[PDB]
Design a protein around this ligand. Structure first.
Ligand SMILES: Nc1ncnc2c1ncn2[C@@H]1O[C@H](COP(=O)(O)OP(=O)(O)OP(=O)(O)O)[C@@H](O)[C@H]1O
Ligand SMILES: Nc1ncnc2c1ncn2[C@@H]1O[C@H](COP(=O)(O)OP(=O)(O)OP(=O)(O)O)[C@@H](O)[C@H]1O
Ligand SMILES: [Mg+2]
Ligand SMILES: [Mg+2]
Lengths: 287, 303
């Protein structure tokens, strides 16, 4: 849509919305040539093919979109080709398992300026997409998320793959290795302290979970390269929450920055209460 | 009992389960961990105890390693995680929320046989190379299935080994495994009826060649000088999509290629399709007819 990372985000969310347990992201030239997301979700029924094309409509205007899909109620799958207006160029029977594969080829080709900027800044744009990819890998418990990349004429190479584990801890281990888990402690939520409450509580509905680096000297990280925040399992960047987490960690380890995976679960406001719970909990953890 | 046959047994089990994704995770070339994850049919609860070159496979792996299995059948509401002792007995079974499929973890293969374990470690480079060859064969022939493999040495980062893109063609799987540059020097196999000259060389009559039921397909290097390979490091033969080593067929392919490029050896991916009743060392009935078809076809291709 706007970038490589947001295009991947939209396609992954669509696979998640379809109830997929396998989500495979296939890239060619870091996504400059091909962005392809394949899932084993519910698929699309024939009567809704034209209704596919909004994320998918915007992708059609900015790239060449091919979609293959097979609904559980269908006897055979279907392969669809779209023009830049979202109109179906052709639809043919296509033998494939249940699910949907969305192919985004030559993203931004219809906008030459954006296409050229995409290529020039591919290292930064790919790093943003990896961050989004890692966030979904960590939080999507029970879902096997994978990514592969193929550069030029070279062989296809695996980038990451999760094992469909029910715990965030194992998903973290799948993404970064077991060595990353050895320097982490689980988040332990505490009621806000009288002192911290004064610095800023009976109707507390915030539930915090996750992992953070130990405050022990040397155990931290050189930068904020691995900090993942979630509100109701949705990846996001809460500025005030992120600053508070790094501030409390620096109270005990000013030389380093922590690894962070924090999910904020709350009913469908009162952010000062959330910060008071976060600060009190982090102080009790690092003490 | 080797690293390659252990991986082969697990990959075949995932293929038998109807998997479309097969993920192989290795640690220390498989000395520390061999883990195969698939999205196949899984195992039903009533068959958990029944779970425990041929390496059965799972019972033999339990005797030689620590086997952990998580699985979820479509008929189950929640998956199950299983731990096995070296006699194949279930140490513990716990509910385990996971998607449909099976994950088999083989950690410290051959640990219970210290002599074999040291031979495994000492010859790990040769055993790992043999396993990669077997894995490449399944990657090439398993069209429509995403097979991936990584290897991790100690505490280092995961290293890519191979991965296919779930493509419907053997040609695309070759490109995924070896790169598009490998495809540029290949030509497709074109089957021809055996020629009178080649039929005479094998002592075949017109009636012997009338019941031809061999169907050969695949890819081979061009005979153009220099385009070949330094050795037979990339020659993959299949009978009814099954990886195998037909000695006479393999020698014939290299012999005809040497008729046009004696200095080099070709890249070979060749599947031989034939009725199951004619396969019995690979013993193919009417093998002289198959060799005559192969030689005649290869000569027409390289001419
Ligand atoms: N991988 C998919 N699997 C099954 N159905 C899909 C998939 N992707 C898209 N669809 C269907 O096509 C519809 C339009 O997709 P689109 O992403 O453009 O908008 P949306 O999903 O409805 O809302 P949002 O803007 O939040 O993504 C979707 O609502 C969905 O029904
Ligand atoms: N990845 C798997 N997915 C689903 N079921 C499996 C899987 N692996 C093993 N099983 C089940 O456990 C049984 C025993 O496995 P094992 O490989 O040891 O023997 P086998 O497959 O029955 O015969 P063989 O391996 O000699 O062809 C299998 O028959 C199968 O039902
Ligand atoms: Mg959407
Ligand atoms: Mg088996």
């Amino acid at each position: 849509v706007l970038s490589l990372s947001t295009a991947v985000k939209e396609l992954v969310e669509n696979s998640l919305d379809a109830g997929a347990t396998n989500i495979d992201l296939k890239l060619k030239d870091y996504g400059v040539d091909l962005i392809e997301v394949s899932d084993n979700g519910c698929g699309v029924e024939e009567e809704n093919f034209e209704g596919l094309t909004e994320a998918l409509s915007s992708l059609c205007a900015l790239s060449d979109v091919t979609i293959s899909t097979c609904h559980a109620s269908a006897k055979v799958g279907t392969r669809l080709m779209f023009d830049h207006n979202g109109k179906i160029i052709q639809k043919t029977p296509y033998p494939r398992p249940r699910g949907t594969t969305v192919s985004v080829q030559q993203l931004f080709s219809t906008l030459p300026v954006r296409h050229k900027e995409f290529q020039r800044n591919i290292k930064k744009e790919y790093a943003k997409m990896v961050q989004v990819l890692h966030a979904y890998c960590i939080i999507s418990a029970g879902i096997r998320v994978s990514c592969t990349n193929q550069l030029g004429q070279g062989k296809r190479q695996p980038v990451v793959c999760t094992g469909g584990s029910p715990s965030i801890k194992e998903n973290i281990g799948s993404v970064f290795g077991q060595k990353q888990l050895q320097s982490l402690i689980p988040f332990v939520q505490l009621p806000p302290s009288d002192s911290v409450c004064e610095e800023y509580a009976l109707h507390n509905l915030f539930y915090i979970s996750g992992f953070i680096s130990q405050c022990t000297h040397g155990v931290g990280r050189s930068s904020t390269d691995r900090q993942f925040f979630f509100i109701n399992r949705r990846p996001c960047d809460p500025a005030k929450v992120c600053r508070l987490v790094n501030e409390v960690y620096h109270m005990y380890n000013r030389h380093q920055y922590p690894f962070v995976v924090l999910n904020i679960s709350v009913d469908s406001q009162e952010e000062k209460l959330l910060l008071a719970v976060l600060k009190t909990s982090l102080i009790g953890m690092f003490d």
